[PDB]
Write a protein that holds these residues in place. Structure first.
Motif, PDB file in Angstrom:
ATOM      1  N   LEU A   1      -1.387   3.015   5.822  1.00 52.27           N
ATOM      2  CA  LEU A   1      -2.286   2.316   6.753  1.00 52.27           C
ATOM      3  C   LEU A   1      -1.597   1.128   7.410  1.00 52.27           C
ATOM      4  O   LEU A   1      -1.611   1.008   8.633  1.00 52.27           O
ATOM      5  CB  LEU A   1      -3.555   1.830   6.043  1.00 52.27           C
ATOM      6  CG  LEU A   1      -4.576   1.047   6.885  1.00 52.27           C
ATOM      7  CD1 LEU A   1      -5.043   1.878   8.066  1.00 52.27           C
ATOM      8  CD2 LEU A   1      -5.766   0.625   6.039  1.00 52.27           C
ATOM      9  N   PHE A   2      -0.989   0.269   6.590  1.00 56.15           N
ATOM     10  CA  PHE A   2      -0.266  -0.912   7.087  1.00 56.15           C
ATOM     11  C   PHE A   2       0.907  -0.511   7.974  1.00 56.15           C
ATOM     12  O   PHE A   2       1.222  -1.214   8.931  1.00 56.15           O
ATOM     13  CB  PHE A   2       0.238  -1.806   5.946  1.00 56.15           C
ATOM     14  CG  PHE A   2      -0.836  -2.280   4.995  1.00 56.15           C
ATOM     15  CD1 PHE A   2      -2.119  -2.612   5.441  1.00 56.15           C
ATOM     16  CD2 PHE A   2      -0.551  -2.425   3.642  1.00 56.15           C
ATOM     17  CE1 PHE A   2      -3.088  -3.054   4.554  1.00 56.15           C
ATOM     18  CE2 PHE A   2      -1.522  -2.868   2.752  1.00 56.15           C
ATOM     19  CZ  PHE A   2      -2.792  -3.182   3.210  1.00 56.15           C
TER      20      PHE A   2
ATOM     21  N   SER B   1      -0.843  -6.425  -4.959  1.00 57.43           N
ATOM     22  CA  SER B   1      -0.234  -5.237  -4.393  1.00 57.43           C
ATOM     23  C   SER B   1      -1.285  -4.139  -4.283  1.00 57.43           C
ATOM     24  O   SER B   1      -2.032  -3.886  -5.230  1.00 57.43           O
ATOM     25  CB  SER B   1       0.929  -4.786  -5.271  1.00 57.43           C
ATOM     26  OG  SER B   1       1.717  -5.905  -5.649  1.00 57.43           O
ATOM     27  N   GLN B   2      -1.332  -3.496  -3.121  1.00 58.73           N
ATOM     28  CA  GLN B   2      -2.307  -2.449  -2.850  1.00 58.73           C
ATOM     29  C   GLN B   2      -1.689  -1.075  -3.142  1.00 58.73           C
ATOM     30  O   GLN B   2      -0.463  -0.961  -3.239  1.00 58.73           O
ATOM     31  CB  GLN B   2      -2.764  -2.546  -1.394  1.00 58.73           C
ATOM     32  CG  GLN B   2      -3.411  -3.876  -1.014  1.00 58.73           C
ATOM     33  CD  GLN B   2      -4.861  -3.973  -1.442  1.00 58.73           C
ATOM     34  OE1 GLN B   2      -5.200  -3.747  -2.601  1.00 58.73           O
ATOM     35  NE2 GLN B   2      -5.724  -4.311  -0.503  1.00 58.73           N
ATOM     36  N   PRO B   3      -2.529  -0.026  -3.288  1.00 57.02           N
ATOM     37  CA  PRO B   3      -1.993   1.318  -3.560  1.00 57.02           C
ATOM     38  C   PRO B   3      -1.069   1.868  -2.471  1.00 57.02           C
ATOM     39  O   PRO B   3      -1.086   1.388  -1.332  1.00 57.02           O
ATOM     40  CB  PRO B   3      -3.244   2.202  -3.653  1.00 57.02           C
ATOM     41  CG  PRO B   3      -4.384   1.283  -3.882  1.00 57.02           C
ATOM     42  CD  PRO B   3      -4.006  -0.055  -3.330  1.00 57.02           C
TER      43      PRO B   3
ATOM     44  N   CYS C   1      -8.335   2.542   2.207  1.00 60.06           N
ATOM     45  CA  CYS C   1      -7.127   2.615   3.043  1.00 60.06           C
ATOM     46  C   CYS C   1      -7.028   3.939   3.800  1.00 60.06           C
ATOM     47  O   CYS C   1      -6.669   3.956   4.979  1.00 60.06           O
ATOM     48  CB  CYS C   1      -5.872   2.353   2.203  1.00 60.06           C
ATOM     49  SG  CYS C   1      -5.700   0.592   1.812  1.00 60.06           S
ATOM     50  N   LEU C   2      -7.359   5.034   3.118  1.00 59.52           N
ATOM     51  CA  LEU C   2      -7.493   6.349   3.758  1.00 59.52           C
ATOM     52  C   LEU C   2      -8.544   6.343   4.859  1.00 59.52           C
ATOM     53  O   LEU C   2      -8.347   6.962   5.899  1.00 59.52           O
ATOM     54  CB  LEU C   2      -7.849   7.446   2.739  1.00 59.52           C
ATOM     55  CG  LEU C   2      -6.778   7.935   1.758  1.00 59.52           C
ATOM     56  CD1 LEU C   2      -7.354   9.048   0.891  1.00 59.52           C
ATOM     57  CD2 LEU C   2      -5.519   8.405   2.465  1.00 59.52           C
TER      58      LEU C   2
ATOM     59  N   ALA D   1      -9.674  -4.046  11.796  1.00 63.34           N
ATOM     60  CA  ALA D   1     -10.474  -4.838  10.874  1.00 63.34           C
ATOM     61  C   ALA D   1     -10.303  -4.353   9.430  1.00 63.34           C
ATOM     62  O   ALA D   1     -10.094  -5.163   8.525  1.00 63.34           O
ATOM     63  CB  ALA D   1     -11.941  -4.794  11.284  1.00 63.34           C
ATOM     64  N   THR D   2     -10.385  -3.036   9.234  1.00 67.66           N
ATOM     65  CA  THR D   2     -10.187  -2.421   7.925  1.00 67.66           C
ATOM     66  C   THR D   2      -8.805  -2.761   7.394  1.00 67.66           C
ATOM     67  O   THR D   2      -8.669  -3.238   6.266  1.00 67.66           O
ATOM     68  CB  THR D   2     -10.338  -0.891   8.006  1.00 67.66           C
ATOM     69  OG1 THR D   2     -11.638  -0.581   8.508  1.00 67.66           O
ATOM     70  CG2 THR D   2     -10.171  -0.229   6.635  1.00 67.66           C
TER      71      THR D   2
END
Length: 614
Positions: free
Chosen positions: A138-139, A130-132, A102-103, A119-120
């Motif tokens: 990022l989102f 659930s993501q960090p 994500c970074l 794309a990432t």
């Protein structure tokens, strides 16, 4: 020289200071575990540490198993500082830390790589868990550039509901500009999909309501496949299902009916995967035909398998066998069996057993080039593992062994396997050789550990001693203090209360659950419990082995409404992949151990060949 200068450095370093390490470091240059101290010395003070030092460390000790956690901790810092030039030099997507991934996406968006960062972002977004916290950022950026369409919120909502993460799915459905209703409904149907019985409430002809129903039908297929099938018939004309959704619904219903042995699966599985593109549907179409005694059709189906399935010993077996059941006076299977018989797996033993020929137990310890053997023993990771072993740090020595093994080629791995075997360390040898896939060394892969104990308790409970080896070998791989997340402990993976229900019945000393690691007392209760299950199914190892793994109530469900069912067909048609493999291994392993105990065991006993609940 000889020194605890390690221990006392590791004491001071463990919750404290570096003074003993710093002084002793000069004296500990040659010592192979010294880099573990350096790691912790540096890890403590990592926020103050310079790029030049960390960079140098990652070079000169990149082989350590715990290096990734330093890379994670460090790249987190570089990204927070804005040292992106350095971040990218070290960002490795293979570490599989989503925090870094994500970074890295943030970087891409910030540095003119927008296609690549979109794309990432999307890749990490379309994920049903659930993501960090780093991905929220990022989102956030991703959203800011108008890339988070309602569709992409909806698509993740779909995945969150599939994954039963309903708090996430709710959070996403309360972020739908226009689709808030169908979103709540998606979560309602995901939770209880029997609601689709109310065909009135799910009549609205749009691509969203289709998505709700299609999820529901797939969810409902697990536990009420018969209801799901009826409802598919209603909903297909009623709703605008895409073609590929229809397939995924039919797949789920088809497989769930197939595992219940319902012929209604066959027409469905035939309509929606006619070209045999889905390997699971194809395998279970064939299994269902074998269960129903429809040998001709099973045989036909085995002749059209994709390369990958046809190549397995399984479908090589079942092509011969289905032909033999279809046309018992044909001689054509003999040829087919000969190609396959004398392979060293389960289906090879079946094919050998079918020809009435001896099994080929191909033991061929491969020639090790000792330039390779000594390169592997002169590895830093090996000497670190060797040295961890002496000391008694057992997790550490394992950790080093397995990490080293991810980079080792087929030759390097086999060398490692022989080294671990020589230290009477049977599991790392079993695990190293299995990664190399040199299957043809059965000294290493099928070791004779605790032999006096297993043979005693097998004779005691009136059991084939080959079999108790097989159960042990399959349950743990001779890791004497194995443990699992479920809670099964020891050589024979005895569940804690399974080992006390058994302790009462037989009247056996069990004064602690920490004595279920002791080979002598673990084997003894597990031998008795095996015998319970054994006698529960009339001394049928095929059924008892399944029941050991899957529980006996399951095995009885799998025997329902049978009559004169062949052992090979029963096994093949076990619904659980985990349990079919378990049974086929145990039976195979006991053929091997039968030889090694000079007490030959055919793949199955005369009395196990046919069975039923009739």
């Amino acid at each position: 020289e000889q020194r605890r200068l390690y221990d006392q450095a590791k004491a001071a370093l463990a919750k404290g200071n570096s003074a003993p390490y710093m002084a002793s470091r000069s004296a500990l240059r040659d010592y192979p575990l010294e880099p573990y101290l350096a790691y912790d010395e540096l890890t403590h003070r990592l926020k103050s540490a310079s790029n030049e030092e960390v960079e140098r460390f990652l070079t000169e000790h990149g082989d350590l198993p715990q290096i990734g956690w330093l890379k994670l901790r460090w790249l987190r810092l570089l990204a927070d500082r804005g040292d992106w030039k350095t971040f990218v030099n070290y960002y490795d997507p293979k570490l599989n830390f989503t925090e870094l991934d994500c970074l890295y996406g943030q970087y891409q968006l910030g540095h003119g790589q927008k296609a690549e960062g979109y794309a990432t972002s999307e890749r990490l977004w379309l994920v049903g868990k659930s993501q960090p916290a780093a991905c929220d950022t990022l989102f956030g950026l991703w959203q800011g550039e108008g890339q988070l369409t309602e569709e992409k919120v909806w698509k993740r909502l779909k995945l969150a509901a599939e994954a039963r993460n309903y708090s996430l799915a709710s959070h996403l459905a309360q972020r739908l500009p226009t689709l808030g209703n169908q979103g709540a409904l998606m979560v309602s149907v995901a939770q209880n999909p029997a609601q689709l019985s109310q065909t009135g409430r799910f009549s609205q002809r749009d691509h969203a309501t289709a998505d709700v129903v299609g999820l529901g039908l797939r969810r409902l297929a697990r536990q009420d496949p018969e209801k799901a099938l009826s409802l598919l018939d209603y909903y297909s004309s009623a709703l605008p299902f895409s073609s590929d959704e229809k397939v995924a619904i039919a797949r789920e219903i088809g497989l769930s009916l197939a595992k219940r042995f319902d012929p209604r699966a066959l027409p469905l599985m035939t309509q929606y995967d006619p070209g045999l593109r889905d390997n699971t549907v194809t395998e279970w179409r064939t299994r269902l035909l074998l269960r129903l005694g429809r040998w001709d059709e099973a045989y036909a189906l085995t002749r059209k398998l994709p390369q990958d399935l046809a190549a397995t010993s399984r479908w090589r077996y079942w092509q011969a066998r289905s032909l033999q059941l279809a046309q018992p006076n044909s001689k054509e299977p003999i040829a087919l069996y000969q190609k396959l018989a004398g392979e060293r797996d389960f289906y090879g033993f079946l094919a050998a057993d079918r020809l009435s020929v001896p099994y080929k137990l191909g033991n061929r310890p491969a020639h090790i080039d000792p330039r390779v053997l000594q390169r592997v023993r002169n590895a830093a990771s090996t000497r670190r593992a060797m040295e961890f072993f002496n000391r008694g740090e057992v997790i550490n020595a394992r950790r080093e062994w397995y990490h080293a093994a991810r980079l080792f080629d087929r030759d390097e791995l086999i060398a490692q396997a022989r080294l671990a075997y020589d230290m009477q360390w049977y599991f790392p040898a079993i695990r190293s050789i299995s990664q190399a896939q040199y299957w043809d060394d059965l000294d290493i892969r099928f070791p004779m550990a605790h032999r006096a104990t297993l043979v005693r308790e097998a004779k005691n409970r009136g059991l084939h001693s080959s079999w108790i080896f097989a159960i042990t070998r399959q349950q743990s791989a001779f890791m004497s203090d194995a443990r699992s997340g479920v809670g099964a402990t020891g050589l024979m993976q005895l569940m804690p209360g399974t080992a006390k229900e058994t302790s009462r019945k037989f009247g056996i000393p069990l004064a602690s659950t920490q004595q279920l690691i002791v080979p002598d007392v673990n084997i003894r209760l597990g031998a008795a419990y095996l015998s319970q299950v054994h006698s529960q199914f009339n001394g049928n190892r095929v059924l008892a082995s399944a029941a050991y793994n899957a529980g006996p109530g399951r095995v009885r469900q799998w025997l329902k409404d049978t009559r004169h069912l062949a052992f090979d067909v029963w096994i093949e048609t076990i619904p659980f992949d985990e349990t079919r493999q378990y049974v086929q291994n145990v039976l195979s392993y006991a053929v091997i151990y039968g030889q090694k105990l000079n007490a030959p065991q055919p793949i199955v006993d005369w009395h196990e060949r046919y069975f039923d609940d009739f």
